[PDB]
Design a protein around this ligand. Structure first.
Ligand SMILES: CCC(CC)(c1ccc(OCCCC(=O)NO)cc1)c1nc(C)c(CC[C@H](O)C(C)(C)C)s1
Lengths: 11, 240
């Protein structure tokens, strides 16, 4: 769930 | 009658974060599905909004304290506020002269009729434009514009947020910065802070109406298929 949000929130 | 070192740092951080996530050249617009002027503008505006969500996420990650929140609270804040941050940051391209959003060339100049061709009605677009001209008339400094965006994003009073006290403390710090900034640096800004807080209240009403119209849109698969995976995730109803 929220696959893209989680990715984009990483750095 | 002076800003502190920590307050000045917060302003510099937020202004830099905004410059890193807002492209004054609008040069990525040519990579969206083109405008067509059925919901002929839906592909182009879906891509515009998807791009905008990515920038809003990039801005959020540079808000002091935001990255220290739990992943669940970060998502909860973004899902509830993204549409409001998009409405706020669209004000930079809004023009009082013809009540439209000019993002570069004539192909990326949007009026109310264009957004109706993406599935929205005047029940949203009439208040949206009145919101934009009233916000434009405020003539916000860049510092104030980015602070209002960060204050909107760090609102603890959204569904799904868990650490209300930490998020409110972060939002309180930003409001104190905004109030001090308007005091020292904005001449004739006696009533400006209250006008900006009122704008945050207008945005909740716009948020509500847009969510109504987005649900009606995205429940029809022939339209939801024109959206992007990021739009579907962020504007969708899933909960962590
Ligand atoms: C009406 C104004 C406009 C569209 C013209 C807008 C949005 C973002 C803008 O972004 C400026 C530049 C960003 C940049 O340059 N970033 O770096 C400028 C204008 C929108 N407003 C809302 C609320 C919209 C909702 C979309 C809708 O829900 C569906 C796509 C699902 C149908 S579309």
């Amino acid at each position: 769930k929220h696959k893209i949000l989680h990715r984009l929130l990483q750095d | 009658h002076m800003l502190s070192d920590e307050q000045m740092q917060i302003i510099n951080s937020l202004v830099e974060a905004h410059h890193k996530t807002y492209d004054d050249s609008y040069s990525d617009f040519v990579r969206f599905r083109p405008p067509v002027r059925r919901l002929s503008m839906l592909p182009h505006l879906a891509d515009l909004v998807s791009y905008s969500i990515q920038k809003v996420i990039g801005f959020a990650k540079m808000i002091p304290g935001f990255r220290d929140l739990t992943a669940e609270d970060q998502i909860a804040l973004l899902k509830s506020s993204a549409i409001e941050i998009i409405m706020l940051r669209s004000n930079q391209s809004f023009s009082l002269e013809d009540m439209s959003w000019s993002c570069g060339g004539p192909d990326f100049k949007y009026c109310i009729n264009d957004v109706t061709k993406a599935g929205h009605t005047l029940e949203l677009l009439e208040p949206l434009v009145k919101f934009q001209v009233g916000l434009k008339k405020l003539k916000l400094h860049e510092e104030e514009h980015v602070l209002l965006m960060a204050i909107c994003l760090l609102s603890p009073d959204r569904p799904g947020v868990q650490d209300h006290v930490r998020i409110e403390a972060l939002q309180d710090r930003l409001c104190d910065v905004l109030q001090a900034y308007i005091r020292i640096q904005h001449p004739g800004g006696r009533l400006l802070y209250a006008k900006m807080i009122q704008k945050l209240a207008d945005l909740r009403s716009l948020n509500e109406e847009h969510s109504k119209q987005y649900r009606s849109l995205s429940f029809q698969p022939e339209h939801s298929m024109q959206l992007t995976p990021l739009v579907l995730e962020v504007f969708g109803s899933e909960v962590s």
